[model samples]
Target: RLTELREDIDAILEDPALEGAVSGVVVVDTATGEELYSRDGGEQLLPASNMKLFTAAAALEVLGADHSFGTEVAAESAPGRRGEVQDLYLVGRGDPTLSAEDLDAMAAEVAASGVRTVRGDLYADDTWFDSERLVDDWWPEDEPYAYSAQISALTVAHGERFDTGVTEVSVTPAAEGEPADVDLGAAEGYAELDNRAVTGAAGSANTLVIDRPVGTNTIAVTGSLPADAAPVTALRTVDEPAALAGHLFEEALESNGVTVKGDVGLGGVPADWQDAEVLADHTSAELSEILVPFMKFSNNGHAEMLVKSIGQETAGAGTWDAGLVGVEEALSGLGVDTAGLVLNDGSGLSRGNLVTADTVVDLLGQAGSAPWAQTWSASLPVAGESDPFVGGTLANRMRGTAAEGVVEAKTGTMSGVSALSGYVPGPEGELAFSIVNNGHSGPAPLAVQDAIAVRLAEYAGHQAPE
Candidate 1:
């Protein structure tokens, strides 16, 4: 039966749709640490977001599950003539969970402490990480949007409820022949909108388009809206995360009736801030609490944050170059073949990242082992479940199939790349597998991987025909 399974999967891999494309498959027995199948599984290939699995696994072991982030609003060491500091300081500890509301609460806390105004400038200290904002080799055009938002130690989400540096833009049609309405999801005020969308005739196609141009804060929105068309929402990545946090924090202080006599800008948090007295601070949920959102959404911000955090903790440096070293060291502890891994960015946003299917399967096989196994495995997306946090990227996939609700995996996708790797039940027991389909698209690629999962679920171990 197992041999038949291999032959059946080989046939699918040979489909014309996969011609000229790179593909790799590897399966391992979870319980016995045995390799069950391999097909070009050792070829190095671009992993896309699949690299997050390595990052996650390494983070769980190196950073531990209970680690949390802290964002602090601290006052200068001295007081002004009338109960104000010479300069106000805001320090970020790489908390992607920081929300505008949290900043507002921090401001309120400041006000409650009897500080009426900051007589000097409001400075943002994001020097926790190196100044390398974007990872090398990422698409240059992907900037100014949430998925590829620049990494910064200090940053703000677009809303009171946060998803890192993302903002939601909504477009609604006006009455017939009138201009449609455009709204930025939150008041980041970092960009100007050039709305050129006019209402089209009744029942006409709504062609709304919205995007923030790279290297600038100008959002060019153009298209048409049908007379009765429903509102559309799009997520955008904002540029300059540290400045965004400063501006938003300034506003939060204002809304809470605190006044700043000077401008807000970026600076390093002074080394002496420890004895300067913190006005207030926000602590993020534990890393264990964050693994789900980070993995489910494949959040680049969260992944990068963890990388820098690891670097800061391990080597006293918060830069990608140092972070990569921390990552490799952690994976080495997990028994992964670190020599086979070539990682550029923690989120796998860089096309420079390469890993073999054998490496993936080996990592997955050990990812859910010993004391931390349950916590690590639960982060993978479960097919057929709709919970965004739990089902994650796999929520709507593989519905009503043999693999439905039985496969827990991490999904990866990019132009010419797709990968699914994780745990599933075979007829005999649990197994770990990795299937990376490259240079493919449409339904064919996913269908091929899904078929493999389904067959694996029905496997009955080694057998000869009757």
Candidate 2:
């Protein structure tokens, strides 16, 4: 049985498509930690987003399942005899789930407290985390992408309209030879735009280009749209997360009939901030509740925030250096050798990350024994499931195969790299496997990954496939 399984995996690995690709594979029995098949499993390779598995494990360990973030709205001074505060301060403890609705509710809270006016500027307090918005070694070019949103404790997100710290632009065709109808989603007024697209003939090519000029709040939409066609969309990250949050909260205040006579700015809370009265406060869902989307969507921002949060909790600082120390410590307690791994960033956006298949498989084997094992494993991407939270990145893969509904894993994707690591039912009970291919520039490496899991699913009690 082992011989046939080895041959099958070897054939896939050595195929002409992957001829020059550097690969690592490890399949082990979960119960006994026996390696059933392995090839160069000790050699480190680029892990891509598979790096999140480590972050998730460590976060679940170091930050208990009950951990939640906080955002508070307070006045710089207590309300006067007439209930008027001089200034308003918004302090965030890295609540990544904060939304525009939350800001509006906060404004209502302030109004309910009889604070009808703010004589001073609105201050955005994000001092909980350092000023480093981007992680070290990340691609300089990815800074502007929505997947790489800026990190800020005082950040607000558009609810269900687009990604966190981002907004969407949709363009629809108008009458032929006329301008294309543009919709900026919910950030219509918040995000400025320069639309240069025109409606073309019916059945024209779908080539809409939306570009957000760097270091600016302006976005440009140019290209041709076909008449009588559906709308096309583009998503963009905000230029200044803190400023955006302040602006939205300010708008919410004005909408509630409160008045701010000064500008909005970012700064530290004064030592006397404690004298201020809390008008409104929000607590985010617990860490365990957040794990569902964090892992399912492979959210880079969420992972990085958790890393910084870990640092803040363990070291009294919110820098990556401090956070990674906590991450390594948590991993060590799980029997994972922190000395054998190189984790550049929690999101694996940096190609500098390297890991061996053996290490990942060992971690998966150990995951079953974790106190948060049920929550951790449930957060993984499930194959061929239609539900977004249930299937995640694997929702659209492995359909119509034995692996469907039988495989739950973590997927890593980057140019020239692809990986799959997780658990699948095996003849000897449950199998933990990790497959990573670096330097592979071909289609369907994921298909090969799905094929391996499918074969494992077919194998029963040490017998070959039927």
Candidate 3:
């Protein structure tokens, strides 16, 4: 029965629509760990954001799901007048979950702590991770793009600057060519404000582009933002993470009853720096939740930071290379063949990642049985037929249909690549599958992949081996 089904699916691959497309598919039964169907499953292809599954699972297993990253607020050695420090330090320990609201709350807490003012600088210690912005060999021009923003341990909104008044800030969304309608109250006064200044109809969709010229604090915003929708702005790139780190820490300190008179600066962790009162200790679970946003939203910075965190925790060096080692080790231990797996960075933003459908299927199957299986599964976005544009193609078509809730998977896409890997719970119980297509061609390959998924589910429903 399995052989017949496999042959039928293989026949679909020869369709004229799928011609010239490189693709792979695999299905495994979760109930009994059975490989039901496969085609070029051993071949490696670009997994795009789908690679986050590996990163997330590895992190959960090693760091546990309940971990939280920590940010330290400590006093520097500079003596303070009347028991006040000359300078205060905001040390970031790669806490990716730290938000602006959290920073504001932290500041308020420090302000309420009784320290009124400090005479020294507010130094931001972000040296915990290496200083390389882009990964080893990322394209230089793409650095300014939001998706291409350099990964830093400390980043807000993926490091893109937001312009609330302009409506369509460089890295955010707004009415096409018009400023965002949403009002940014306090954020405007805090940062230097600049808008490319494009206005469009209220209901039209707009794209806002951010550009940074040489030696300029002003970011150039050009392009249209979709009108009618609320004004949105994203951080495209941040040159000085330490500065943002300082700002966030300062806000936290001010709220915590600490006051400073000078400006925020960047520095290193002093050798004599000892553990002061630990304000917060984020564990692995909290970090996992943070990683969910990274996976669900495909936040490249978050993924990379999580990778750095893994490297730091396991290898004692929170660097991209170290993290890749950890990821490779974790996958290999799980019996997934890592031959074609080339991980240049944790996030697939670097076009350097490659993996096989078979490997992904094996990884997902193993994770489905792990204690933290739900965490791994929940990390994927649900496929939605009603709103196909929102989720990945495979997810959109597979949601709530025959495969619906039973098919929980991760989809990956790049210019010429589309991939899917995850578990599909069909009538046969639960089956793991992976599909990857690399090559520019008609929609035939994608259609065939979807058809295969549905057919597999139908086969499973009949009590056939997955």
Candidate 4:
């Protein structure tokens, strides 16, 4: 039966979709601790978003499942008898789920605490993480998208999906030949708009484009929009996420009856103020709950933030250099062999990451038996599941096939890299598999990966007599 399974996988790898591509495939029976199949399993290849597997597991082991991040409004001292305070600070400790409304609630709390006025500048304390936003190897062309958003310890999440450091740009057409209107949700006043887009004729093509130029906090709108087309919205990254959060908080403070007679800027809470008073506070959802959006959608910002958080929790430093070391240490401690792993960035957006299929399968075996296995496994995108939260990136894949709802995995894709690795539960014994393909010419070999997954889902204890 095992030989037959090996042959089946070999034939699947021979598909023309993988022509000229290097594929690392491996499968193992978790219950029997037996290797079912292997093909270039020891060869290292870029795992793309599959890199998140290591990140998520390491975070769970190092930070604990119950861990939650915190943000606070603090001052050097208590309000005076006239309800006045000096040099207010919005100090954040890496809460990725902190929303504008969350800031509002904190402001409301400030109002209830009898703090009527801020006599000094409103400073955003993002000192928890280093000022480095984008990873060293990340492409600048991908900077405007939400997935490539800047990492920050103090930032506001845009929507329920908790996308940090980005704001939605909604574009609507006006009269033909007139300037199209642009709305910057959440970052209305924070991000400057350079609107050069114009409305086109009713039947003309819509060539509208929105982008944030390099090294600037401006959302530049260009091209044209058809008069009859529906409104378009895109999530674009902002330059300084901490400053944007402070801006939102400043607006919230005013709305909640707290007057700020000062400017909003970035700074850390003065360490000399040992008697600082926390006027308002907010706590993020536990790590277990956050993994849903983080993993399912393959969020890059969340992955990096978690890596930094792990670094802070373990080494008291929020730098990526410290965090990656912490991630490797935690993985080694979790019984995973780290020899084949080279992690460059937590989100796998970096081309510098590499992992072997055997290594991934080994991680699967170890992670499946770990204490937080349930939380870890549940976060994987279920194959063919309709619900975005449940199926995640795989929601639309393998529908109507045996692998549908049977295979739970992480999907990774980039210009020349693609990977699908996770679990396929069976009655005889559960199977953990990984398929990483690199150097594809035209497009990702997603169909080939799906075929392999479906074959595994249909595998039984024995094959029919040939």
Each candidate's root-mean-square deviation in Å? 3.3, 2.5, 5.2, 2.3
* All candidates: TM-score: 0.93, 0.94, 0.81, 0.98
Off by over 4 Å in 2: 159-162, 186-190, 426-428, 460-466
Candidate 3 per-residue lDDT over residues 317-374, each given as its tens digit: 8788898898888777766677878888776766788888888888887788788877
Superposed Cα deviation of residue 334, candidate 3 (Å): 2.7
| Tens-digit lDDT track of model 2 for 26-145 | 888888877888998998998888889999998888888888999988886566657677778888888878888888888898888788888888988888988788876776556657
Worst 10 residues of 2 by lDDT: 457-466
- Pairs that clash in candidate 2: none
Q: How many Å off is the CA of 324 in candidate 1?
A: 1.1
Question: Residue 453 in model 2: shift from native, Å?
Answer: 1.3
State the C-alpha lDDT per candidate.
Answer: 0.81, 0.81, 0.64, 0.92
lDDT assessment of candidate 1:
0.81
Candidate of highest lDDT: 4
Which sequence of candidate numbers ranks them by TM-score, best first?
Answer: 4, 2, 1, 3
* Top candidate, metric TM-score: 4
- Model 4 whole-model lDDT (C-alpha atoms): 0.92
Better of 1 and 4 by lDDT: 4
Each model's total of backbone clashes: 4, 0, 66, 0
Candidate number that wins on TM-score, 1 or 3:
1
